[PDB]
Amino acid sequence: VFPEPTADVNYIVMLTCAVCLVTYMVMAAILHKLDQLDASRGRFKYEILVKTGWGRGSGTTAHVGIMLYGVDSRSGHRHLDGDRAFHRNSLDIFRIATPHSLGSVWKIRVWHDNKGLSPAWFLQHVIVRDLQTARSAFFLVNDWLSVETEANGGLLRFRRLLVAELQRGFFDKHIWLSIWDRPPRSRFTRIQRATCCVLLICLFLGANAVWYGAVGDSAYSTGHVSRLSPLSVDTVAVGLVSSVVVYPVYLAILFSLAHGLSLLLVAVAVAVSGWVGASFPPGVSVAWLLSSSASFLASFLGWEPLKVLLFLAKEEARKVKRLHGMLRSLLVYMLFLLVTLLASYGDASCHGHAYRLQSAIKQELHSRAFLAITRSEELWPWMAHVLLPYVHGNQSSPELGPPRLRQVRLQEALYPDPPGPRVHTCSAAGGFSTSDYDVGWESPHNGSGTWAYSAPDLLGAWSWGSCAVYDSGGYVQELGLSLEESRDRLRFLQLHNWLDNRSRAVFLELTRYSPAVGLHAAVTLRLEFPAAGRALAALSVRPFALRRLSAGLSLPLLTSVCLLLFAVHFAVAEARTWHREGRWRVLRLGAWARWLLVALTAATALVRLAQLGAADRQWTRFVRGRPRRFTSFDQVAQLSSAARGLAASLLFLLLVKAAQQLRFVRQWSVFGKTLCRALPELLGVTLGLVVLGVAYAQLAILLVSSCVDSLWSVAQALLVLCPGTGLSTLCPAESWHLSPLLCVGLWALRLWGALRLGAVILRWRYHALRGELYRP
């Protein structure tokens, strides 16, 4: 079967392949550096005497060592050469440079070296009692045997023939835990392991993509891939068969310059992942990742452990420990970055379609007609002219619920404003009085009339009104029976004036849905009026994808739970350090930055879960009866948006962290050092700039808001303003927002020089840092 006749792209496969390739590149660079450092040189060790002179007759050049087969460190024997170089009838008494660490258990083994003459001297042992950790014993067999006969001991039977060998190659042939736990001077280069590891993971990805994309109909046709939730038989039984199904091919290279060609094969691997995965439904691309993870876990737990069945020294030690910690941090950060990327850019096509949909909705309702309104009486013919054909006509065939209408004047009729102008922003208001009413006006006939108050609901209490905001309070309308009853209802409302009188807003919002793109939208219009007649205007269209918590195991849920796990891991890791130091964990970035990172990571998942739950609840409420209510989806359209922003912020942080990690290049480590060293002077200059900017901003706005094009002759030309606006159109009497003030101050600072002063500081520091790190 030859798939992919379409042209859309799947971003999950591309993102994961890019992440794996980048992490391989970084690991390859660092591991090559470590390999060259180790090859340039190529506890258990005590500082006690090794004078073994209990025998003689073994005069020959001999240099042997010990094998401390202990816990977490099991190195082989070594050699050394002194002045006499172990001449005839000479016993060596010295300590060698062994970094292996043993324990206080039965973990000791010593090798021999019989080159030429047979051994006749009886070297008992190196008498050591307590030097560093007392990981040896001052006693042994002290006997003579054949050539190269190493004496055994504790501190040939089949049950113990090679069980000790399972402590040498256990972390050697296990390709995962072998890139930092290999013995010195091995024929593996410590980067061939990384090459075969990346080949293995890319081949798991390719096999899973091939099975889910092309070979999925011969066994079961007619779309067998229709279940995404883990039922213990799916998304797991595919990993092991794949796993195994390429295991042998991985072996084929494990057995040699085929690696230079191996990187070619890996390439074409992701090629099929970039081809067969394009036509993946969302439910299939979230199970493809799970199957790959299951296959990797099975290889890490089931198959690899079964395959194995068949001075300056301190400086080097701290360097290798630091490099191992850097590897661990690199892997953790790469996993976190992959999770964040999947959380952010899973549906970019929906992003573009959403922008286009909101633009089309705005252009299809004559938005610039609604924006330029000054008559409260033309709103009714506007609604009867363009809004009614939009709601009821064949244009908006998908509507998803009847429209609705409501406002707030409170209990007080408006007054005739002066012709032309009006109140400042919203003067001569009312308040907000809640009570039942009847047809025509608030005058009950026999009891509670149909014109109720429509009090606020359980969720959705946010309108962000310029003057006042409610949740759902207002004269709720129906506007059903699209045929003719809409005009009749509008005429009845205009005549009886049940809601026409005592009005101060509009707050109209119905619905939108795009069956092709697969996105819903909430469109709301506000026409807050200071009094009768003149009014303001505002439009807000929010598109979103309606995904619910009960839908299953969609990508947002998995990303959210992974983000929560990462957040709790970071929290406990920081708490361990905090409890270690008790108190006084201040005056450093440290905890003050880790806490903010944890807060961001927790919020970016909590908000996603909250929006999923809200969407599910609102969808159930709408589905209860669809052509009766309005269901006010707008709340969801807010939460999702907020969540998106949070995700972006998180990614932003991670990205800048990458720049901070570029200091590992020695010649490129001076920029970060320069910034860190010049930070105090920069902060002082920043304080001065802030003071100057505040002074200039409140001079400029004071001059501007005191005249109508009659300010001055000198100051009219030396006054800078925020970019994007002129000098005639300013000073909004509705609100003096702080953001225009900040923009004016910052841009005035930027245009009057005043920002090249940093060049005065940094330059100096840069010079000062090229005499203290390049000269000596």
Binding site: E681, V691, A733
Partner: protein, 459 residues
């Protein structure tokens, strides 16, 4: 010992900030803007699309005074504070010398406006005060400093009526018996309004200038003023703030007098004392303007009820404009004054020493920069003087170049006026100011900074 100075300055600064915020939201800009839109934006008549901002001939002005002026003045819904006044300044026939080469077809000439060439003879039907010259003293006015010239306060004046049916008749009579001859040079219209809906007095002045080359040039000024009274508790709060400000400025001035009495031999080498005396003199002149305005504000309400007399209230508008201009620079300097406290650390000391040790070099380079600036401005004035209107006068050239430095070029009129030597001017100015000269400033500062740090080592 500076703790007391810092705390008293902090109280002074917060008092000034709260006063500024009180003046911040006076909501006078919006009313003046939408009242200017009532006069300068509405079409002159129902057929013509022109307005006062786009007058182009005598007929347009004559239609304005019978039309958009009358309907928008007798009807937001403000009420008059008396009778508006319309005045004319004119020159005399034969005020220049016609060359003898071509004088058989030209019989009369009218020079540009000047006190020497002003006319004083009674022209037209000598009925009232609109056809006879009255001196400045009887009019109680001053110069205006218009666009093409400065105009005296004398001329031929007429006060209109409070009823539209009579003012329209008066202006129709003025139009019939020709009043705007070829000798007319300027026309002023002055009045005032209240708009009882929101308590805000406004004085309105409109000027039409008739150049000797034909056409008209319009100009306008609307100035608001308030009759503040203790009507709430917030105004009392601002009144207490004003008294606190008076006490603070008295405190500052008396201790400045003490500090200058103890060190009168040398008082100008320090920079902060000059800033302090500038601040105190600005504050005292601003408070004097404010007290004069609040003392003379008790006379304007006499015309509110009924008075068929023109109120001359231009001095109040001028001094209010001056008061706003003074207040802006006062708060700026009292924002700069904040810079002498932040000098607590060693790095702040190094920065302050760097800025103080390079003042003379910056002042010296400013002279060269301004010499080149004036050379370029004179070149631009000579080249684009008669075409672009951003270079019509020397100060306009100076301000246009300043705006060019901040990136406010047009380059369309510049290119059209002179296809060569226009683009040359623009390119050379941009290259030599954005790449060479303005950098030199920073260079100076840069060197000083290094030198400062160097001596630290030697110390």
């Amino acid at each position: 010992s500076v703790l007391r100075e810092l705390v008293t300055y902090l109280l002074f600064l917060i008092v000034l900030c709260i006063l500024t915020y009180g003046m911040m939201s006076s909501n006078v800009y919006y009313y003046t803007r939408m009242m200017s839109q009532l006069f300068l934006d509405t079409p002159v008549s129902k057929t013509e699309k022109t307005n006062f901002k786009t007058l182009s001939s005598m007929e347009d002005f004559w239609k304005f005074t019978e039309g958009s002026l009358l309907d928008g003045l007798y009807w937001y819904e403000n009420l008059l504070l008396g009778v508006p006044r319309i005045r004319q300044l004119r020159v005399r026939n034969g005020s220049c010398s016609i060359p003898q080469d071509l004088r058989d077809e030209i019989k009369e000439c009218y020079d540009v406006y000047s006190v020497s060439s002003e006319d004083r003879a009674p022209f037209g039907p000598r009925n009232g005060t609109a056809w006879i010259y009255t001196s400045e003293k009887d009019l109680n006015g001053s110069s205006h400093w218009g666009i093409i010239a400065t105009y005296s306060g004398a001329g031929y004046y007429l006060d209109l009526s409070r009823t539209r049916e009579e003012t329209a008749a008066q202006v129709a009579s003025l139009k019939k018996n020709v009043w705007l001859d070829r000798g007319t040079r300027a026309t002023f219209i002055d009045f005032s309004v209240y708009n009882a809906n929101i308590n805000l007095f406004c004085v309105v002045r409109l000027l039409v200038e008739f150049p000797a080359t034909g056409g008209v040039i319009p100009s306008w000024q609307f100035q608001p003023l308030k009759l503040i009274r203790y009507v709430t508790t917030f105004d009392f709060f601002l009144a207490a703030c004003e008294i606190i400000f008076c006490f603070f400025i008295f405190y500052y001035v008396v201790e400045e007098i003490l500090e200058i009495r103890i060190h009168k031999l040398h008082y100008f080498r320090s920079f902060w004392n000059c800033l302090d005396v500038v601040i105190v003199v600005l504050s005292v002149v601003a408070i004097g303007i404010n007290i004069y305005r609040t003392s003379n504000v008790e006379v304007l309400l006499q015309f509110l009820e009924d008075q068929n007399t023109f109120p001359n209230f231009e001095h109040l508008a001028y001094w209010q404009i001056q008061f706003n201009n003074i207040a802006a620079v006062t708060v700026f300097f009292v924002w700069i004054k904040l810079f002498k406290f932040i000098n607590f650390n060693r790095t702040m000391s190094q920065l302050s020493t760097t800025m103080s040790r390079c003042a003379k070099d910056l002042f010296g380079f400013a002279i060269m920069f301004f010499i080149i600036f004036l050379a370029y401005a004179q070149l631009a004035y000579l080249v684009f003087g008669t075409q672009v209107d951003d270079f019509s006068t020397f100060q306009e050239c100076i301000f246009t170049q300043f705006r060019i430095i901040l990136g406010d070029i047009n380059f369309a009129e510049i290119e059209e006026a002179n296809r060569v030597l226009g683009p040359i001017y623009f390119t050379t100015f941009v290259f030599f100011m954005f790449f060479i000269l303005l950098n030199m400033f920073l260079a100076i500062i840069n060197d000083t900074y290094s030198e400062v740090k160097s001596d630290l080592a030697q110390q």
